[PDB]
Design a protein around this ligand. Structure first.
Ligand SMILES: NC(=O)c1ccc[n+]([C@@H]2O[C@H](COP(=O)([O-])OP(=O)(O)OC[C@H]3O[C@@H](n4cnc5c(N)ncnc54)[C@H](O)[C@@H]3O)[C@@H](O)[C@H]2O)c1
Ligand SMILES: NC(=O)c1ccc[n+]([C@@H]2O[C@H](COP(=O)([O-])OP(=O)(O)OC[C@H]3O[C@@H](n4cnc5c(N)ncnc54)[C@H](O)[C@@H]3O)[C@@H](O)[C@H]2O)c1
Ligand SMILES: NC(=O)c1ccc[n+]([C@@H]2O[C@H](COP(=O)([O-])OP(=O)(O)OC[C@H]3O[C@@H](n4cnc5c(N)ncnc54)[C@H](O)[C@@H]3O)[C@@H](O)[C@H]2O)c1
Ligand SMILES: NC(=O)c1ccc[n+]([C@@H]2O[C@H](COP(=O)([O-])OP(=O)(O)OC[C@H]3O[C@@H](n4cnc5c(N)ncnc54)[C@H](O)[C@@H]3O)[C@@H](O)[C@H]2O)c1
Ligand SMILES: [Zn+2]
Ligand SMILES: [Zn+2]
Ligand SMILES: [Zn+2]
Ligand SMILES: [Zn+2]
Ligand SMILES: [Zn+2]
Ligand SMILES: [Zn+2]
Ligand SMILES: [Zn+2]
Ligand SMILES: [Zn+2]
Ligand SMILES: [Zn+2]
Ligand SMILES: [Zn+2]
Lengths: 251, 251, 251, 251
């Protein structure tokens, strides 16, 4: 019977057509949030919107690329047109080329920075200004355990994640006075069916060994934290990093 | 309309007679938890159980000293009477003398360690075993911003809150496989009646400037995070540190 | 009267003609390091080389832009031509537009990222492979206290410097087997010529008041740490972040 | 040919008789420091002074228990007699029992805390006062990787070392005005001869795998960083925690 004060407000969830973003959208809607579900995938974004409408919640699907600053502008105006924008979850992420730092391809590095960092930046610009004018809010940026620690062959990913904590802090420092809070969430390895369906049974069991809890997290487990940080309950929580990693980074 | 997944179990709130402890007990009871308010101050702890009971909640008081390991054994029994124990908040803490390391009294150092660190460990011992026995749960150790950063003339206090992150980290690693989660919460300067009663207007301002949000935090604001990480919704969050600091440590 | 085990090997130092990168190159070459001083400003790189050679040290200038991957291929080759490349200090950086996250120029954001992060990555690529090749070495990345904590209106910079900590961690993990150590250094505010030149005395004062020591650092004071980490003495130090901030991030 | 600007003054190295304390004494002395080995083992402390005078340096033993505040007072008198005290390494530490938090021996916990933390504090009080009067100095506090991250079954230790970073921060803030620097070192697992002696082949192989460099640290490698941070070359470094771990904490 978990419910969060996220009503009477619109909420953007970028990359919300699948996995953790989906879990976020559904959870936020199911506490009364007007959820603008944005994604490169028009059809997934609609497929989610349909569940939220079917569950009894308001939700709308903008399709687009977060690397387009204009698309960030157009997700804020679409959200504001459901309810005042008072929530943004910059979740949309790709995993990138699997290569060492000396072998990493300059286009693949640049792509991973563009999406996992710069698109969060482009998205935040019209989120901060909207929330700031309409009296306050909460931006949740989707980082990782790998915004704190390393993992071999995922340098660009590791690097992007790490960058987010600094942009999170700075946005939080700058817009605290406008009562717009900015936090970062830091999951351990989550069973997003991309992961499940990409990994061998041997590989899955290895990562499982990295986390003290002895499993991978579920999307719903990240969403619950995101929803809490996005709520009025977390009114004193800004600029900070929050792990959901079943004890990965504790050793 | 915030509500947390803590029903059908007992919660020990140490130093729950007053301040953030009192906010926590209130907030935990209100969502269905059976709260054992433990305090030195038997009557404070009673006063709090009444508000719970006059709000429809369930709760009992136990007066004792967390510095006595026995009292921590006795707190777990008393809680497990009410319902199976699955939450414990080690919240009880004290200020200690206002001095520089080189001028610190060997008693005030030893005292602040004993209460603010050792007593947290003493309570944890039975807390863990009892939670493991009954298939798992959640321990939230009340730390601070000052378990991460310094404050001048509060060495003993800062040292103790730093310590708590390690204890938290080890306990989480060691009892993951028992589904017993352990986390720590770092508030910024909270507006308790003792802080309101102690601070000059000038000193109060100075601390406000140090927080990005441009105010001290309210107890209910710490209470909310604690209730969430104590809840089933936080089932993948363990060993981690969680700030509720209004952007104090983001600069 | 300090000396460093940095002899019989070549040492790239990006941003070499000015402030901190200059001090690095001096300190390294004064312990017998063959210093390639690389920089946009040919004639600034030349003026440092001369100071080295004048003190007895072996140094070469190679003016260009680190935002060209070609110019890190070339910088390495021209280092290997003096002595085996066993040291690289990715020090070159820029500050970017003084503006809020919401108002931040996209041009300036991408230009601050490019120099401070991507160029570090482009120049680390051949560095890593080159040092791996001459049976080991050490890369030092010039981050900041602002890879740890925020400073408002410098979001891009802060974001960039935060990123380096991940890249650094990932490089280290990935090339530890090949005995190539990677480490970040985090200075606080340093009185470079350009910092002394553009700060007003009022600004300068305010900053000194945020550092415990009550002054800004000197470049001499950053180069020593850089030199030590880049030496054979720091043989068991890889992947870690080392603050030279006069107590700035301790509060 | 590494040398450190640690001359024209006395150093305290507590635990200076064996392992990382012994390596520290040897390294400091060689660069013109007048070392006061202080240790429990009367003999071992003397055998280290002998190695120091044999290589040509200046050194004195003083056998005692750091847990005795008076012995700190006496150690500092002894140092101030050799030369004005401007180094203090609080190196002296013990393991405690290998048990879970819930089963952990209450005296073994209290013992560990007493030495690893409180003794460092007891010792610091006269260290700090003496260094402020005689125009500044440095205090290196020996922490560990286990001051940041957990290790299963060593909870009292992990706790004690975490605590050191708080004490280290606070001291640093309070006496920065008096030019007393306070830092912490975090070694990874170090194959000191006592550790060479107590590990099975199976257990040593397990720890080596946890370190990116794929071997345990040598005590000379920890000795070098301690020496640097203690030196005039580190004059803008205070309040900070310096890992020498072999990439242990970078994953
Ligand atoms: N183990 C994990 O899965 C894990 C752990 C930590 C953090 N994360 C982060 O969580 C977020 C979501 O991860 P996930 O595992 O749920 O991913 P996913 O692959 O399941 O879904 C991500 C969605 O992002 C969308 N997307 C990609 N690029 C886009 C772009 N340029 N514009 C718009 N939409 C775009 C895709 O359509 C996709 O549906 C990412 O930021 C990821 O980095 C994932
Ligand atoms: N500024 C703040 O108020 C602030 C900020 C961050 C963290 N905290 C932490 O929150 C916790 C609660 O602090 P607060 O501000 O609500 O203070 P408080 O004094 O208002 O409440 C603390 C309660 O703990 C009890 N207590 C103290 N020592 C005890 C002992 N040995 N045995 C049993 N009960 C004992 C007291 O009787 C008191 O009722 C402490 O750990 C404190 O350090 C407080
Ligand atoms: N307060 C400070 O000065 C301070 C403190 C912390 C960190 N840092 C970092 O230290 C490094 C040096 O900064 P600084 O203070 O010495 O500044 P600086 O301007 O004095 O030195 C930077 C040098 O890099 C050169 N440069 C810039 N872009 C380049 C490019 N694309 N290719 C080649 N050369 C280029 C400049 O011409 C200059 O010689 C940077 O990474 C900076 O962020 C500086
Ligand atoms: N693997 C490692 O060796 C390692 C890694 C990281 C941190 N550390 C820390 O490094 C420090 C030195 O440990 P070590 O590896 O040299 O261990 P060690 O046991 O070889 O040396 C510790 C020394 O301290 C002395 N000592 C102990 N209690 C004392 C007391 N009360 N008063 C005076 N002297 C006392 C002992 O006689 C001994 O010579 C400790 O603080 C330890 O926790 C050790
Ligand atoms: Zn389509
Ligand atoms: Zn599909
Ligand atoms: Zn499944
Ligand atoms: Zn109030
Ligand atoms: Zn700070
Ligand atoms: Zn030119
Ligand atoms: Zn010029
Ligand atoms: Zn000057
Ligand atoms: Zn050996
Ligand atoms: Zn780790």
């Amino acid at each position: 019977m978990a419910q969060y004060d996220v009503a009477d407000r619109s909420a953007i969830v970028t990359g919300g057509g699948s996995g953790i973003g989906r879990a976020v959208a559904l959870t936020l809607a199911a506490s009364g949030a007007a959820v603008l579900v944005t994604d490169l995938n028009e059809e997934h974004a609609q497929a989610v919107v349909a569940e939220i409408e079917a569950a009894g919640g308001k939700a709308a699907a903008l399709a687009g690329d977060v690397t387009d600053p204009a698309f960030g502008e157009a997700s804020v105006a679409a959200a504001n047109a459901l309810a005042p924008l008072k929530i943004a979850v910059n979740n949309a992420g790709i995993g990138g080329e699997a290569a060492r730092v000396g072998d990493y391809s300059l286009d693949s590095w640049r792509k991973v920075i563009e999406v996992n960092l710069n698109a969060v930046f482009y998205g935040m610009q019209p989120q901060l200004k909207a929330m700031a004018a309409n009296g306050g809010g909460a931006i949740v940026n989707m980082a990782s355990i790998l915004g704190l620690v390393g993992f071999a062959n995922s340098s660009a990913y590791v690097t992007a994640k790490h960058a987010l904590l600094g942009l999170t802090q700075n946005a939080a420092l700058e817009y605290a006075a406008d009562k717009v809070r900015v936090v970062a969430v830091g999951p351990g390895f989550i069973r997003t069916p991309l992961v499940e369906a990409n990994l061998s049974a041997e590989a899955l069991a290895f990562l499982e060994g990295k986390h003290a809890l002895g499993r991978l997290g579920e999307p719903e487990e990240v969403a619950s934290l995101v929803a809490f940080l996005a709520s009025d309950a977390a009114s004193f929580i800004t600029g900070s990093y929050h792990l959901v990693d079943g004890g990965y980074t504790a050793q």
